[PDB]
Amino acid sequence: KVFTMMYDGQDLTDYFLVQEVRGRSVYSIEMGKRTIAGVDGGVITTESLPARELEVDAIVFGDGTETDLRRRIEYLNFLLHRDTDVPITFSDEPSRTYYGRYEFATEGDGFHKVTLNFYCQDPLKYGPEVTTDVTTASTPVKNTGLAVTNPTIRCVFSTSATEYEMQLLDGSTVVKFLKVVYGFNTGDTLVIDCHERSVTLNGQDIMPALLIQSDWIQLKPQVNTYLKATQPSTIVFTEKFL
Amino acid sequence: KVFTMMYDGQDLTDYFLVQEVRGRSVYSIEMGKRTIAGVDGGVITTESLPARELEVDAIVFGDGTETDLRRRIEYLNFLLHRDTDVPITFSDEPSRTYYGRYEFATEGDGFHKVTLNFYCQDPLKYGPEVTTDVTTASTPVKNTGLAVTNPTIRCVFSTSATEYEMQLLDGSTVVKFLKVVYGFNTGDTLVIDCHERSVTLNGQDIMPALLIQSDWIQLKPQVNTYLKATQPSTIVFTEKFL
Amino acid sequence: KVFTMMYDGQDLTDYFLVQEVRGRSVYSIEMGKRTIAGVDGGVITTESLPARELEVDAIVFGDGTETDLRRRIEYLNFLLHRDTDVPITFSDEPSRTYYGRYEFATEGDGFHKVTLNFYCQDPLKYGPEVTTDVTTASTPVKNTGLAVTNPTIRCVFSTSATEYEMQLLDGSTVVKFLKVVYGFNTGDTLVIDCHERSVTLNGQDIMPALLIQSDWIQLKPQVNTYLKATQPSTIVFTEKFL
Amino acid sequence: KVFTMMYDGQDLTDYFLVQEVRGRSVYSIEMGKRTIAGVDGGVITTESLPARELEVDAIVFGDGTETDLRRRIEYLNFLLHRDTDVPITFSDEPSRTYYGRYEFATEGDGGFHKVTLNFYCQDPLKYGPEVTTDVTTASTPVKNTGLAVTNPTIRCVFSTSATEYEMQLLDGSTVVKFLKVVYGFNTGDTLVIDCHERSVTLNGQDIMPALLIQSDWIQLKPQVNTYLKATQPSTIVFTEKFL
Numbered sequence: 001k002v003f004t005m006m007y008d009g010q011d012l013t014d015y016f017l018v019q020e021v022r023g024r025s026v027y028s029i030e031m032g033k034r035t036i037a038g039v040d041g042g043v044i045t046t047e048s049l050p051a052r053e054l055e056v057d058a059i060v061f062g063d064g065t066e067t068d069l070r071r072r073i074e075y076l077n078f079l080l081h082r083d084t085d086v087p088i089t090f091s092d093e094p095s096r097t098y099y100g101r102y103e104f105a106t107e108g109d110g111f112h113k114v115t116l117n118f119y120c121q122d123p124l125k126y127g128p129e130v131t132t133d134v135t136t137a138s139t140p141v142k143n144t145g146l147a148v149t150n151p152t153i154r155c156v157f158s159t160s161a162t163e164y165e166m167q168l169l170d171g172s173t174v175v176k177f178l179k180v181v182y183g184f185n186t187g188d189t190l191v192i193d194c195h196e197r198s199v200t201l202n203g204q205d206i207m208p209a210l211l212i213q214s215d216w217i218q219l220k221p222q223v224n225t226y227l228k229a230t231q232p233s234t235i236v237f238t239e240k241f242l
Numbered sequence: 243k244v245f246t247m248m249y250d251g252q253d254l255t256d257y258f259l260v261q262e263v264r265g266r267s268v269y270s271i272e273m274g275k276r277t278i279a280g281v282d283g284g285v286i287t288t289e290s291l292p293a294r295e296l297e298v299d300a301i302v303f304g305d306g307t308e309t310d311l312r313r314r315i316e317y318l319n320f321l322l323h324r325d326t327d328v329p330i331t332f333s334d335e336p337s338r339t340y341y342g343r344y345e346f347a348t349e350g351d352g353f354h355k356v357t358l359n360f361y362c363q364d365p366l367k368y369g370p371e372v373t374t375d376v377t378t379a380s381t382p383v384k385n386t387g388l389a390v391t392n393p394t395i396r397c398v399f400s401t402s403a404t405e406y407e408m409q410l411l412d413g414s415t416v417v418k419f420l421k422v423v424y425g426f427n428t429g430d431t432l433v434i435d436c437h438e439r440s441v442t443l444n445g446q447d448i449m450p451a452l453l454i455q456s457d458w459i460q461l462k463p464q465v466n467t468y469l470k471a472t473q474p475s476t477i478v479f480t481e482k483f484l
Numbered sequence: 485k486v487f488t489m490m491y492d493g494q495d496l497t498d499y500f501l502v503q504e505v506r507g508r509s510v511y512s513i514e515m516g517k518r519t520i521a522g523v524d525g526g527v528i529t530t531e532s533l534p535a536r537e538l539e540v541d542a543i544v545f546g547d548g549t550e551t552d553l554r555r556r557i558e559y560l561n562f563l564l565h566r567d568t569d570v571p572i573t574f575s576d577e578p579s580r581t582y583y584g585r586y587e588f589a590t591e592g593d594g595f596h597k598v599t600l601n602f603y604c605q606d607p608l609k610y611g612p613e614v615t616t617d618v619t620t621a622s623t624p625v626k627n628t629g630l631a632v633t634n635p636t637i638r639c640v641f642s643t644s645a646t647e648y649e650m651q652l653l654d655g656s657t658v659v660k661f662l663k664v665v666y667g668f669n670t671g672d673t674l675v676i677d678c679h680e681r682s683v684t685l686n687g688q689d690i691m692p693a694l695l696i697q698s699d700w701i702q703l704k705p706q707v708n709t710y711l712k713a714t715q716p717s718t719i720v721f722t723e724k725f726l
Numbered sequence: 727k728v729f730t731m732m733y734d735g736q737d738l739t740d741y742f743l744v745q746e747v748r749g750r751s752v753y754s755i756e757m758g759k760r761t762i763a764g765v766d767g768g769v770i771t772t773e774s775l776p777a778r779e780l781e782v783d784a785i786v787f788g789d790g791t792e793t794d795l796r797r798r799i800e801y802l803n804f805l806l807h808r809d810t811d812v813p814i815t816f817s818d819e820p821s822r823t824y825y826g827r828y829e830f831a832t833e834g835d836g837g838f839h840k841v842t843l844n845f846y847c848q849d850p851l852k853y854g855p856e857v858t859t860d861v862t863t864a865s866t867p868v869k870n871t872g873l874a875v876t877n878p879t880i881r882c883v884f885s886t887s888a889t890e891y892e893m894q895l896l897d898g899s900t901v902v903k904f905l906k907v908v909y910g911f912n913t914g915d916t917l918v919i920d921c922h923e924r925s926v927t928l929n930g931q932d933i934m935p936a937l938l939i940q941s942d943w944i945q946l947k948p949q950v951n952t953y954l955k956a957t958q959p960s961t962i963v964f965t966e967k968f969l
Contacts, residue, residue, distance in 0.1 A: 026347035028345070029323065242319040260594075305486075519756075525847075725803070
């Protein structure tokens with residue numbers, strides 16, 4: 001049972017042997033610094049997380065023959081070239097998914113050492129998704145991840161509806177909220193924040209219902225978020241890490 | 243009793259082992275030099291203290307397992323990423339605080355060597371704050387720090403007032419003064435030489451009272467500053483070092 | 485939960501930090517080679533396992549002060565100097581004990597890198613001890629270790645005895661046997677194939693009873709050893725590895 | 727289909743990954759040189775093939791865990807330590823067997839552990855496919871298809887009665903060497919092994935006195951015919967050998 005790397009659901013480690021994986025240690029920060037002549041110090045103007053570069057140091061294991069090796073590489077190119085971000089996973093870190101695509105290779109020097117470089121537009125790893133029940137009272141919802149997350153609201157109606165609201169609060173003060181005036185019974189409303197949609201009874205997008213520009217929610221990490229809904233709801237967020 | 247580093251009140255050394263801390267030796271100076279062809283020498287046009295970069299060389303002590311290490315780093319990222327300057331301290335230098343934020347890491351190659359780089363907008367280390375009483379007689383006020391400070395004159399009235407004054411003298415000759423034309427009893431005035439503001443009864447602005455360009459006062463280091471106030475005052479400064 | 489090294493039941497890793505432990509990889513073999521001029525090839529004359537040298541690469545974590553460090557090393561010397569072989573263990577390999585003693589250090593050059601060298605007279609690591617019951621029928625006894633063992637046959641009599649025997653068979657053919665001519669009831673016999681001794685009623689020597697050169701028995705690794713005793717016996721061996 | 731290395735019938739490459747195998751290139755020769763002061767040149771006094779050292783440069787592939795790695799190495803030691811020469815084979819060179827045993831390892835440096843394993847071969851030669859040729863009652867050419875000198879094996883299953891069995895190595899019509907035996911009978915198989923230097927009957931009973939007079943064992947030179955003639959239709963079996 002060796003170290004496995006999965007790229008778009010393909011086990012790449014069936015084609016090569018992984019020496020080391022750089023790109024997942026202490027993350028760095030892009031800072032905009034501005035300095036003025038004669039004035040001591042500097043000033044941080046901007047701060048952002050750079051995109052992630054995963055660098056896999058591999059050994060392409062040869063099939064004895066030379067033509068067999070040439071053909072393995074051709075196939076490896078087939079598996080790697082992607083025009084869309086893709087789920088990347090490592091066996092040493094379960095419950096974690098990276099989303100990026102292969103970018104470039106740097107060939108090193110008995111056999112074939114290669115550094116495969118993968119680019120991730122979204123610098124964050126995505127972990128297990130957590131489902132919490134939200135009652136008609138102030139409910140604490142703790143974001144177990146280490147980064148701020150956007151949650152999916154889910155309410156499968158028990159009684160008739162007129163106006164559905166998922167209010168966020170600070171003790172007893174409504175900070176942000178989500179409102180929908182379309183009412184019915186027995187079906188599932190689905191307010192996702194990562195993709196920003198509004199599904200119904202059996203999956204139809206009811207976008208006109210979001211009346212006022214009701215603020216998109218976020219769950220801060222290692223801290224409770226107090227939520228109160230009109231009807232017994234469900235909050236699903238996905239744990240995220242840098 | 244190991245070497246501890248505190249970042250925003252978090253003991254980072256619970257996550258890594260400190261080899262060495264660069265960034266706190268003989269400070270360098272940014273100088274604007276201008277030279278003219280045919281003219282001997284150069285001319286310093288500007289001089290400023292650059293911002294401070296603290297470089298901590300650490301060993302991330304592993305928890306035996308590989309996934310345990312990946313998760314420790316994830317948490318380390320959580321503790322480090324800050325969007326606001328923060329108090330930084332080292333056990334080897336007590337009564338000293340740096341204000342900055344983590345910026346970037348450079349990983350090296352048995353175990354896991356990392357350089358953590360912290361950026362300080364304010365290049366100065368802040369020491370203990372000193373409060374000295376200034377009497378209605380020439381009072382020596384010694385700035386115990388190693389950098390020039392712009393203090394705060396605080397006076398809480400005992401008797402009635404017609405005009406307040408705080409004077410910086412040279413034996414018996416008024417060098418600078420801070421005359422104020424607004425009087426009352428029982429309330430607090432705060433003359434801030436850093437912020438360049440006036441406060442009465444503890445809140446509201448009294449900017450027009452400082453009549454004539456009533457010179458602002460500074461406290462030079464390792465040297466006495468003689469001050470005489472019209473009413474028993476207090477002088478608040480914080481020791482600073484490069 | 486850091487990597488712990490135990491030396492004579494003392495946790496040495498309370499005094500230093502382990503970078504790496506060399507000395508426990510693919511073992512080498514001392515071979516006596518003899519060559520004759522004009523004669524092709526060589527001849528292995530002798531083969532033996534060299535003694536083991538464990539080399540621990542450590543960082544002596546300082547207590548901030550200089551005198552504190554000098555005193556920690558003094559204490560470290562106290563814990564290390566031994567005039568008798570001692571049990572050595574590493575957290576990464578449980579159920580394994582090395583028997584040796586500290587020999588010498590080679591200091592390297594932020595902090596204090598040291599190689600501690602431990603000498604093991606007995607090159608083998610000792611694992612869990614296994615006790616298997618041997619019946620009056622052909623019993624398979626599997627040596628779970630990776631090295632050949634000379635076990636101990638233990639029999640505590642239930643009925644009267646005239647002659648005891650423990651036989652090593654190949655299906656139904658007695659390969660070796662351990663016949664003993666001295667009988668009684670209620671007491672314990674211990675036939676030690678390592679020490680080559682005989683014990684009755686738990687203490688006294690019964691060496692002349694093993695009549696004919698009644699062959700000594702060994703347990704080969706990863707393989708069954710079929711044994712049949714004249715009375716319900718017990719076979720005690722300790723798993724060993726290189 | 728990776729590069730496989732077999733040691734005593736155990737696939738060692740199930741435990742490690744082979745970077746390179748040194749020890750099987752142009753073989754060198756041990757030469758005894760003697761020189762005399764004032765006399766130009768030197769004199770070769772002895773010449774012998776040194777024993778072979780095979781050097782396998784491997785990567786021990788880890789099982790993720792640290793304890794799992796420690797236990798793999800322990801097992802690898804179990805598979806390697808031998809007190810007897812053993813058949814060694816490499817997938818890149820089929821129809822070839824080396825006979826030696828593991829001797830010593832020399833370690834090296836992230837998430838994988840580089841090792842050179844050194845194997846010692848008392849017999850410096852590789853053993854290839856074995857060839858069976860029929861030898862008639864007339865001068866028979868027997869060609870040694872190997873690249874080194876071989877010590878063959880003569881097998882003769884009697885059709886008629888015997889008084890004396892002879893195997894003569896000739897040069898046209900001149901007996902250079904020969905192998906006779908005074909023991910006669912019918913219907914059974916006789917075996918003369920020039921490698922092991924053994925005399926064999928039906929159930930392999932030693933006929934030690936058979937090699938009577940210095941009736942020498944002979945050898946088959948490579949890429950060249952060896953002319954043999956037997957008293958009773960025989961069979962010669964030799965094994966191809968290479969340096």
